Design an enzyme around this catalytic site. Sequence first.
Site, mmCIF file in Angstrom:
data_model
loop_
_atom_site.group_PDB
_atom_site.id
_atom_site.type_symbol
_atom_site.label_atom_id
_atom_site.label_comp_id
_atom_site.label_asym_id
_atom_site.label_seq_id
_atom_site.Cartn_x
_atom_site.Cartn_y
_atom_site.Cartn_z
ATOM 1 C CG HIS A 144 5.608 78.713 -7.836
ATOM 2 N ND1 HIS A 144 7.726 78.363 -8.457
ATOM 3 C CD2 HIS A 144 5.240 79.172 -9.156
ATOM 4 C CE1 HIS A 144 7.049 79.091 -9.989
ATOM 5 N NE2 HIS A 144 5.877 78.720 -10.371
ATOM 6 C CG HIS A 159 16.660 76.776 -14.634
ATOM 7 N ND1 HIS A 159 15.474 77.301 -15.076
ATOM 8 C CD2 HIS A 159 17.466 78.241 -13.963
ATOM 9 C CE1 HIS A 159 14.990 78.583 -14.365
ATOM 10 N NE2 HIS A 159 16.207 79.134 -13.849
#
Lengths: 544, 550
Positions: B171, B67
């Site tokens: 993930h 991010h």
Amino acid sequence: LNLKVLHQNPAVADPMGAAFDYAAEVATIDVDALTRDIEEVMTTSQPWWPADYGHYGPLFIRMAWHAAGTYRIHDGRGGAGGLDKARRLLWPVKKKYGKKLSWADLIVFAGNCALESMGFKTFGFGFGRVDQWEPMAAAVDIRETFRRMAMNDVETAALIVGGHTFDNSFLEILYGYEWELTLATDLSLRVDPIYERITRRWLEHPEELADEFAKAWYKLIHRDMGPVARYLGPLVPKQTLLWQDPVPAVSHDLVGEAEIASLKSQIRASGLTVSQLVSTAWAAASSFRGSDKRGGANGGRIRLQPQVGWEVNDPDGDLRKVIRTLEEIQESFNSAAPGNIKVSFADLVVLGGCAAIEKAAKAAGHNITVPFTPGRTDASQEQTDVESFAVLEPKADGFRNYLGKGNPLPAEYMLLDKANLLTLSAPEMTVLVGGLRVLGANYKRLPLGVFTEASESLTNDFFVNLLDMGITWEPSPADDGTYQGKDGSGKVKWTGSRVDLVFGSNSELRALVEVYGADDAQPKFVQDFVAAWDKVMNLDRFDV
Amino acid sequence: RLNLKVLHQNPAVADPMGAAFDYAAEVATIDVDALTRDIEEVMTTSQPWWPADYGHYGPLFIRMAWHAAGTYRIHDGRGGAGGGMLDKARRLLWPVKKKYGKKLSWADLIVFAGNCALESMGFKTFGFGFGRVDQWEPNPDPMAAAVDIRETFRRMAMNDVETAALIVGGHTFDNSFLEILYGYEWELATDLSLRVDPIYERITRRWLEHPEELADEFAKAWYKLIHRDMGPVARYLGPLVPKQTLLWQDPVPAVSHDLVGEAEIASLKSQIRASGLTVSQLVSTAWAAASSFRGSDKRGGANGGRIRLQPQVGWEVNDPDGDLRKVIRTLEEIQESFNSAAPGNIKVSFADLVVLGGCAAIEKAAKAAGHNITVPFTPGRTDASQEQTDVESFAVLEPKADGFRNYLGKGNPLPAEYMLLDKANLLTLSAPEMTVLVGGLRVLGANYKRLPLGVFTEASESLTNDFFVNLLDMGITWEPSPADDGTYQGKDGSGKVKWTGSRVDLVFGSNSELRALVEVYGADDAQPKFVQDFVAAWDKVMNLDRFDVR
């Protein structure tokens, strides 16, 4: 919070470099030749801006009155030092000089030289304005719009019977060839009973009108240039006027080394603590304004009525208990001095501060020496003006944690604004706030923002205990606009305010406390604080 | 109107570290064999104000290093790891930044926390390089999401083998996400696109049987993700950086030939001006080679000598219709003739004769005006061959509108006087430098196709300040041209047309700050100041992508 207000006019946008000092340039232009050029820019018509009256005379006056007549008094901004497509008639006289004659000086001097061309002997001119790189109802209206500029009713009924003649010409018509009851927002000077009592003596005694517009014009020009040490050029008059807040000239030999040491040892060796001197040396120098550069440390006026009696300089037993001691030291050093040397009180009010910091820093981790340049003089009581210092009083001072009634903006925008008036920068703001809080300078010694544990010690503990996230900031237990830092165990440990928590809740400023809040950045904080303190004490030293 | 505040962003006044601070002599002493043994403790330590998922701030550091370095927009180059700032959870890293405070910027700390979180889970990454200086402050159908993630990973310039290896990446941390997706054919909200979309399902299905070419693919993808906004490989400080060339850095060969001394630079710049080439060609070529820089991404610049290569010598602004073919031919000939009969082992590269030609051009121009000025020139540039240019990735360096050369393309989002501001901001220029560069380029002669749109002098090929003198003079009157082609023209007092301005310089003559910054240079007896400032600005611009390769 826009921190861009702090670093206005950086050296990056300055095309003259950092080595260009204006005071060393404008003293080399012969104003006996410049005034023989502005006398030629006028009386010379141009195609794009025709005049066909034989003069751009009554247009240069309306370009100084419409440029130096926007001086707001409450915060000092605007005015001289701060028509728009008409200041290009003056290009044919600025291009011959360039860097030696800033645009503000040229516009205002064109106005003055026009005024002198139409047959009038102005009081005098001084250069030095460096340029930045970025119906009674009408009667009361003009009275009020000349009160935001701080001119009494005898210097605003002499500007209007002044720059409207271009001196018994405007008069002897105004209730001269008396009207048929049907001019402008003027004509107030004959109906309003306040103005009509003065602008009727001048009708039969013009001798006291010429030398009233003369000295009311040399107030609309040099209003925001500051004390009389920046009036460069050979035109400045050799006379002192009261509205400049004059200070006596240096009539005594100054102090060198081995005398400053004696004074700043005596100050330590008599009673006064560390949180008293730094509260007096800051109060006498927190009344400065970068725009309209009046006030500041010089003059030694913190002993005088308009400023010893304010609320921020709490006179309830703090200020008058330290002025007496510094005055006591002054007399002892003024008798049997090491030579023909005397010390003005405007030094001990600041030399006390440097010795106070040198007593605290030397006691926290390490000793230093604080720069101190003598050359300040004390101004007596008769030379001050208790009516024009009511505007210097800070309605809210953020460094001393003062918050007075009647606050337009919130409690942190006023700190940001004040740190702009002192011409400070964000790192200097942060380090100075931390130093003042840890040293002890809060209004009335409130334990607000006292995040250190041991008082009277120049540490960086304000920047270390603010960032530690083990504490929680809950306004809820409090009542007023103050916070409270509950420890992780629930017990109250600290206290705060809107001026202190903003440094740990604004990501633009929280990145400026991690520089001083590190582990190996203790010496850096001390050096930066002493540099900021020296800069702030020397905001009104224009002689040097 | 214009916003000149964008040019002087991040001044030294707001920098608490002083002007004597360089973030290249401190971060080299960081003992990264001990900083990792500190990030490895902040991870496995819960806090009261922020509980840890399964008592481990492992995953939270990865999806905070994404991010932060996942907002690199390529259409203009800004954004990325290098500046701009989960700040509520970034304070979790304070117990490490406080031990250094000065040798470890916040960006480096965040991204290194991400990398060491990856290395703490049992995954050896590619490598890390410090040096990001700190600018202080200013349903799941293929058409539903499998095209959205493709497009939001195309603004970042990652192909579909490094965006189906980042999503099978953060993930899992080397495959159990895939064992689930293709272990059940049931039918995990914006994902599962890799099971349905025919483009992604072509490669991901293959990683089930060979779960070892995913590890290195994810390593390369992560390295590219966090080291994309640092430019050429000489800013990678710290001992961790790998020794291997990657094609997306636009590598340049190391210096294998000893450079040129002051006794040879004189001979070279006494040859460039002595063979055919005028003053309007060399300046144009040098500027074109060094106007492809992006100070927000540090990629491009003079270095590499790529103006002779395909993606650069074929653009539209560097008009190849006789300009960039008769120049490169001569400079290459001078290069070979000075190389073969060299004085010694000295052998000059080609990325110099493109720039050393420019400095000789200015030295020849500002000598008929009256002055005599030597231009600084620091050798050390190298030439990059054709196989290391990545023609697919320089299409974004394409200047849609260059304001210094009166170029104006098609589909400009902003008018012609804002593209100039954006270009001057990308080159990390300041307002006086931008103004003096514009004046010098107009007077010298560098306009696209030699259009006399802005040449306010009368004796061109001479470095005067006549651009700033004829612009301010108000005897002439500005009026839009009757042809209405986005230009202007200035009549005299009689009526004859004297000049032909454009929209990129009349902004200098009609703004309120630019007019002051022009009056500074447009005065009388202020020509030497203008010449000095132009040479300084030219030297600064030529040395944009040379400072951070040395």
